[PDB]
C-alpha cells in the first residue's frame, strides 16, 4: 500500500498566484479565475490569470468566427432543427470549392464560398496565436522553443489546407470541416496515392508518433519514480544535479546502456514530438505533386 504520486493525497491552497511581471504588460492580464479542487488532485487548482492582448483578441475572435461559420453551415444542413442537428452532428461537413473553380474565389457561398471564408478565419486565428506563443515567451525573457515546436504542427496544417491545394492547382484538394468527412477525406487520400505504408515520411511520422508515446511514458514514469527525491523540480536539477537526476539516469543506464540528463531529455522530448508533424508534412506535400503513387515510387525510387 505504498503511495504512487499519480493523485495528490492532500491539497493545499494559498493566495492566488498572479505570476511574474518583467516586461509583461500587466494591463493585459485578467484577474485570477476560480480554483478547482477537481483539477487539484492531478495538477494545479488555479485557473487564470490569462493574458488577453490585442493579438489574442484578434485570434480568439477569428477562431470563433471559423467555428461559427462552420456551425452556421451545419444548421443550414439541418434545416434549423435542433433534434436533426444533434442527430447528424458528425455527418455535416463544410466542403471546399469543387475542382472546376481551381484556386479561384468565385465558387458560390454554399458550394465553396463558406469553406474559403472559414479557412480565412482559421488562417488568421492560427497564425495570430503562433505570434502570441512567441510574444508571451519574449515578454518573459524565455527561449523561443514553444514557438519553434508549434511551427512544426503548423507545417502539417499549412500543407494540408493551403500549400498542397495551391501546388495541386485547386482548393478541392484541401480538407473539409466535419468529423466523419475529415476521416473520409483521410481514407480517401490514402487509397489514391497507392499504399500509404510505402511513403517513407509517412512511416517515419508513425515511428515518431509511437516513439512520442514511448518517450512520454518513459519520461513521465521516470519523474514519478524519482519524485521522492524532488525529481519534478527539473530546472534546479539542471542547475545543481541531485540524487533524483542521478538515479533517473542510472535506471536507464543499467536498463539499456545509455541515458540522458535532466536538460537533455527535454531536447530528446521536443524533437521526438516535432519530427512527427515535420516528416508527416513532407510526406503529404510530396503526394500528388511529385509522386502519384508511393508504391510505384518504392519500386523504382524515382
Amino acid at each position: 500500500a505504498e503511495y504512487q504520486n499519480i493523485f495528490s493525497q492532500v491539497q493545499v491552497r494559498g493566495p492566488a498566484d498572479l505570476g511574474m511581471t518583467e516586461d509583461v504588460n500587466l494591463a493585459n492580464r485578467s484577474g485570477v479565475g476560480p480554483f478547482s479542487t477537481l483539477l487539484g488532485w492531478f495538477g494545479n487548482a488555479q485557473l487564470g490569470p490569462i493574458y488577453l492582448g490585442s493579438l489574442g483578441v484578434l485570434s480568439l475572435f477569428s477562431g470563433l468566427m471559423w467555428f461559427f461559420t462552420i456551425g452556421i453551415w451545419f444548421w443550414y444542413q439541418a434545416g434549423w432543427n435542433p433534434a436533426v442537428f444533434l442527430r447528424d452532428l458528425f455527418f455535416f461537413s463544410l466542403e471546399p470549392p469543387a475542382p472546376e473553380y481551381g484556386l479561384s474565389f468565385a465558387a458560390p457561398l454554399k458550394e465553396g464560398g463558406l469553406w474559403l471564408i472559414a479557412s480565412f478565419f482559421m488562417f488568421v486565428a492560427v497564425w495570430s496565436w503562433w505570434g502570441r506563443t512567441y510574444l508571451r515567451a519574449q515578454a518573459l525573457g524565455m527561449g523561443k522553443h514553444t514557438a519553434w515546436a508549434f511551427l512544426s504542427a503548423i507545417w502539417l496544417w499549412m500543407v494540408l489546407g493551403f500549400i498542397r491545394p495551391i501546388l495541386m492547382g485547386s482548393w478541392s484538394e484541401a480538407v473539409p470541416y466535419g468529423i466523419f468527412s475529415h476521416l473520409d477525406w483521410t481514407n480517401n487520400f490514402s487509397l489514391v496515392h497507392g499504399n500509404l505504408r510505402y511513403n517513407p515520411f509517412h512511416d517515419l511520422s508513425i515511428a515518431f508518433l509511437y516513439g512520442s508515446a514511448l518517450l512520454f511514458a518513459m519520461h513521465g514514469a521516470t519523474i514519478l519514480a524519482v519524485s521522492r527525491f524532488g525529481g519534478e523540480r527539473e530546472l534546479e536539477q539542471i542547475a545543481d544535479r541531485g540524487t533524483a537526476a542521478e538515479r533517473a539516469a542510472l535506471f536507464w543506464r543499467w536498463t539499456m546502456g545509455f541515458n540522458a540528463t535532466m536538460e537533455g531529455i527535454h531536447r530528446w522530448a521536443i524533437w521526438m514530438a516535432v519530427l512527427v508533424t515535420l516528416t508527416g508534412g513532407i510526406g503529404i506535400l510530396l503526394s500528388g505533386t511529385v509522386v502519384d503513387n508511393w508504391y510505384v515510387w518504392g519500386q523504382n525510387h524515382g
Binding site: 509583461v24 433534434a83 538515479r247 527535454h266 521536443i270
Partner: protein, 281 residues
C-alpha cells in the same frame, strides 16, 4: 565504465530471484536473473527467426517474414514450417518482454525508486499480447495474429482494418488516436517549456518554474504544473495504448461488421430517427 557519480549506487541487493548469483553488471548493463532470462529468450527467438529465414528462402531483413498458423489449426499447435516457429518465437517474445520488465523492477529496488517505469512498460506488453494472444484466443485461431516482418506486419495492419471498412469508425480507435495525438502535443509542449526556461534569451538568467507557470497561464489561462505534466504525459501515453488494445480486442469479436454502421445506433434514436432533413433524412 561508470558515469562519474555511479559508484555509490552499485551496492548489492534488490534482486527478486537468485540472491547474489546474478547481482552484477556487464559494462553499463545491469544483469539480474532476469537479465539472464531476457538473453535466453531473445537469443532463442533471434535464432528461431533466423531459422525461419532459411526455410523461407532469404536473408534479406526486409523480406524475412514469419507467419502464424493458418486459420485451419485454430488454437492448436502446428508444424514448425507452417506457424510453429511463430508460436515458439511468440513465447520467446513474451518471455523476453516480461523478463525485461521484471529486470526493471530489480533495477528500481536497487536504486530506491518507484516502480512506475516497468508498470508503464507493461501496457505495451499487454497491447502486444492482445494482438498475438488475447484477440486470437477469443477469435478461435492463431491465424488472426500479425506476422513478423518489417513490411508484412504492415500489410496485416491494412488487411485487418479494411475487413471492417474504414477502421477510422472504430470508436475505441478514435479515443486511442486522440490520446496519441494529445500525447505528442504535450510532449512538444513539455520539452519546449522546460528548455525555454533553462535556455532563456541570450545573456539572461535561467528562468524558474514560476516563469513556466506564468508563461502557460498568460497563453491559455491555465498551467498543469511540473508534477502534473509528468502525470499527464504518463496518463496520455498509457491511455493511448490501453484504447489501442481495447479498440482491437472488441474487433472481430463483439463487433465484426463495418465500423461505420456501428454509428447507426445513435441516428436511429426514436426522438429524431424519423424527423426529416439533415444528412440522414
Amino acid at each position: 565504465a561508470l558515469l562519474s557519480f555511479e559508484r555509490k549506487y552499485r551496492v548489492p541487493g534488490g534482486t527478486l530471484v537468485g540472491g547474489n548469483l546474478f547481482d552484477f553488471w556487464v559494462g553499463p548493463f545491469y544483469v539480474g536473473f532476469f537479465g539472464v532470462a531476457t538473453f535466453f529468450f531473445a537469443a532463442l527467438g533471434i535464432i528461431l527467426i533466423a531459422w525461419s529465414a532459411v526455410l523461407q528462402g532469404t536473408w534479406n531483413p526486409q523480406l524475412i517474414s514469419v507467419y502464424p498458423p493458418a486459420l485451419e489449426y485454430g488454437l492448436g499447435g502446428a508444424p514448425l514450417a507452417k506457424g510453429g516457429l511463430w508460436q515458439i518465437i511468440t513465447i520467446c517474445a513474451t518471455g523476453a518482454f516480461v523478463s525485461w520488465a521484471l529486470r526493471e523492477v530489480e533495477i528500481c529496488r536497487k536504486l530506491g525508486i518507484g516502480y512506475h517505469i516497468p508498470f508503464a512498460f507493461a501496457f505495451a506488453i499487454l497491447a502486444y499480447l492482445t494482438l498475438v494472444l488475447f484477440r486470437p484466443v477469443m477469435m478461435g485461431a492463431w491465424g488472426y495474429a500479425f506476422p513478423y516482418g518489417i513490411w508484412t506486419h504492415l500489410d496485416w495492419v491494412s488487411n485487418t482494418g479494411y475487413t471492417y471498412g474504414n477502421f477510422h469508425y472504430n470508436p475505441a480507435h478514435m479515443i486511442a488516436i486522440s490520446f496519441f495525438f494529445t500525447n505528442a502535443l504535450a510532449l512538444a509542449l513539455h520539452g519546449a517549456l522546460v528548455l525555454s526556461a533553462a535556455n532563456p534569451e541570450k545573456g539572461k538568467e535561467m528562468r524558474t518554474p514560476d516563469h513556466e507557470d506564468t508563461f502557460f497561464r498568460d497563453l491559455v489561462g491555465y498551467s498543469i504544473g511540473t508534477l502534473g505534466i509528468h502525470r499527464l504525459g504518463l496518463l496520455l501515453s498509457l491511455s493511448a495504448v490501453f484504447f489501442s488494445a481495447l479498440c482491437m480486442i472488441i474487433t472481430g469479436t463483439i463487433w465484426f461488421d463495418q465500423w461505420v454502421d456501428w454509428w447507426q445506433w445513435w441516428v436511429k434514436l426514436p426522438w429524431w430517427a424519423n424527423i426529416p432533413g439533415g444528412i440522414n433524412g
